[PDB]
């Protein structure tokens, strides 16, 4: 019985490979050989957000593209005002081992989580004026590596227990649990329509889930090592993943396989964070090599470098209006680039 | 300029002031330690003498605070969450010296910690626990360490090794062989920026806190000397 199931799974894998090979009519690099390169994309540090006393582990922008939240090893969840560098808030954290932070699309709530296996929702629009823990979400059996607000009521969190969970914040219960990853899920990215989200785990695979149905639509493979970052394309029909094999790869949801790979011989340091520009033409990747490289998502040629961080770049985000790029680092400094 | 802008700037300055107050208040004369080990080791009882899944242990020795973090709520896969402990002053690695079957697993874990990209700067305070049980096992002799390590047959006790007054030579040779097994990995690829501090601790040892204090003092002194080009 077990052998029959294994053989049928192997033949299903072969059939999927054959279908993908049939769909592979051409390649993104071959098709985009006609279009001109974007040229030397050079940005400069327009703001250096000082105020973190330890390594910055994560950040998240606001939908207003002005307020951004950052999390650090010092145990502070500072909401910044990038326009004027003013610190709007500074939230003390119960655990200093936070690995992720999320800022709600409405801006009323901010979330964080980490090695404490708990996603903590903080109210920013409280009538008393002092931010307090609105809700603590428990149920993950591993470190919470990423979280993203669906809305004021729903949040999606990925954990080191190989599962992604959808939460109902007002009740504090797991509305939906997503299973299928065999490694620590390291990051998740929400689609523009919020009906789908991808996750990148330590099994070198990325899976697309259905938020409403709790089922996995596709599995994307090709990466060689643990995937550290993931980010949907602005179109919503593709995403890019950064892994420990020092390679970024772009996958297409409808084509069900990767389109282009972003790697070089001299690049031997893994990617810690990936993000797309507003048009999706630029893929920004943060590496362990203290630097970030601006890739040409349609041509896989490094169009620029965001040199300027003194330690490992841990987080990287682009505003919803595409006006700026913020990169945090282990040197306790968060920089705004433009 | 405007009233809202002035209020925002004053709030930012107040937040920065409170933030700077918190920073030094909690970071001066306090040190963070990562407690690593296996299930069989007495990691939870090393400095327990006067002690969300991260058992935090706080102890004081000489007006210096030590925050010892024990991660115990994750899966056995640890290549990812261990990078959060880059900035700890030392890693407290506990080994069950009596269990030879898992001692190679402990050696592999020590090697991975030693050679990790984000842990190659942290100095490991090795604690070879269960010394009494190791002594009893070697004295009984039913289980032979040569089966798990054939190169123990050619091993001889180091000249400067300091056995206990009532300690048997066979026990001394076995325990120092295990310590040398760890120290070989420590010195094979060590860049000189971090060091291993082996200690023969027991289940009833009440001086592990002082040992950690002295080792951290030595680690910080060596870091200061390296920073001042004195070492």
């Amino acid at each position, epitope marked *: 019985e077990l052998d029959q199931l294994r053989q049928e799974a192997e033949q299903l894998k072969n059939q999927i490979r054959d279908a993908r090979k049939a769909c592979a009519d051409a390649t993104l690099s071959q098709i985009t050989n006609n279009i001109d390169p974007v040229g030397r994309i050079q940005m400069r540090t327009r703001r250096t957000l000082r105020g973190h006393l330890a390594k910055i582990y994560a950040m998240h922008w606001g939908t207003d593209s002005r307020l951004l939240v950052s999390a650090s090893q010092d145990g502070k969840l500072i909401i910044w005002d990038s326009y004027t560098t003013n610190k709007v808030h500074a939230i003390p954290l119960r655990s200093s081992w936070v690995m992720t932070c999320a800022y709600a699309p409405s801006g009323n709530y901010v979330a964080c989580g980490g090695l404490d296996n708990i996603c903590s929702i903080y109210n920013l629009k409280t009538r008393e004026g002092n931010v307090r823990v609105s809700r603590e979400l428990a149920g993950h059996t591993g470190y919470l590596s990423c979280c993203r607000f669906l809305d004021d009521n729903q949040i999606v969190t990925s954990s080191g227990d190989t599962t992604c969970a959808l939460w109902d914040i007002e009740t504090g219960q797991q509305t939906t649990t997503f299973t299928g990853h*065999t490694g620590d899920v390291m990051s998740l990215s929400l689609a523009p329509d919020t009906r789908l989200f991808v996750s990148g785990a330590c099994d070198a695979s990325a899976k697309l889930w259905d938020v409403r149905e709790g089922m996995c639509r596709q599995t994307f*493979t090709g990466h060689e*090592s643990d995937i550290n970052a993931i980010c949907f394309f602005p179109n919503g029909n593709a995403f890019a993943t950064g892994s420990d094999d020092a390679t970024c790869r772009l996958f297409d949801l409808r084509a069900d396989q990767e389109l282009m790979t972003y790697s070089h011989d001299n690049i031997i340091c893994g990617i810690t964070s990936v993000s797309f520009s507003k048009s999706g033409r630029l893929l920004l990747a943060g590496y362990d090599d203290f630097n970030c490289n601006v890739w040409d998502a349609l041509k896989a040629d490094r169009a620029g470098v965001l040199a300027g961080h003194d330690n490992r770049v841990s987080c990287l985000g682009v505003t919803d209006d595409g006006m700026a790029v913020a990169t945090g680092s282990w040197d306790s400094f968060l920089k705004i680039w433009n | 300029v405007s009233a809202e802008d002035k209020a925002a700037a004053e709030r930012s300055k107040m937040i920065d002031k409170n933030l700077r107050e918190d920073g030094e208040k909690a970071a001066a004369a306090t040190h963070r330690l990562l407690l690593l080990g296996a299930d069989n080791s007495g990691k939870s009882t090393i400095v327990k003498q006067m002690r969300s899944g991260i058992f935090e242990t706080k102890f004081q020795v000489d007006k210096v605070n030590f925050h010892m973090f024990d991660v115990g709520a994750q899966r056995d896969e640890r290549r990812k969450w261990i990078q959060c402990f880059n900035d700890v002053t030392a890693i407290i690695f506990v080994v069950d010296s009596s269990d030879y079957n898992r001692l190679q697993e402990a050696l592999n874990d020590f090697k991975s910690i*030693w*050679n990790n*990209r984000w842990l190659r700067t942290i100095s490991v305070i090795l604690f070879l626990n269960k010394q009494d049980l190791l002594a009893e096992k070697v004295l009984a002799g039913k289980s032979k360490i040569e089966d798990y390590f054939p190169e123990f047959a050619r091993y001889t006790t180091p000249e400067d090794a300091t056995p206990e007054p009532g300690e048997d030579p066979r026990v001394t040779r076995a325990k120092y062989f295990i310590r040398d097994e760890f120290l070989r990995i420590s010195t094979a*690829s060590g860049d000189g920026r971090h060091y291993c501090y082996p200690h023969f601790t027991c289940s009833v040892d009440t001086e592990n806190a002082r040992r950690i204090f002295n080792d951290c003092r030595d680690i910080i002194q060596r870091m200061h000397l390296r920073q001042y080009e004195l070492l």
Partner: nanobody
Amino acid sequence: QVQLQESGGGLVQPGGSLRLSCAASGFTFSNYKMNWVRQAPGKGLEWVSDISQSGASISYTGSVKGRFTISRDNAKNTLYLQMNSLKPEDTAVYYCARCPAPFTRDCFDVTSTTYAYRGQGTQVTVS
């Protein structure tokens, strides 16, 4: 897809010889360290041998020292374990395991229960 297919191994008399072979796919064999991990019946996973990227540095478990010989063929993307003078204590399922990251000399979760970069494994029985 990162795939590691193990071939060879089976029934053998004590003192015999078996040569396990592992075929790598989906990754560059030369950039990663390779291990051999075995799981005796009723026992957890145990790390048997090791080999670096080039193969100059080879490590062994003390029990299998002088009997097993780990061989790496970078051109053929194959990892071998020349097992000599087998004994009944060697009966286990043998997994070729790939270290998680390239260009690194540390291998953290190779012996994990659900490590992603092992193979299905081959049963080796000594009798």
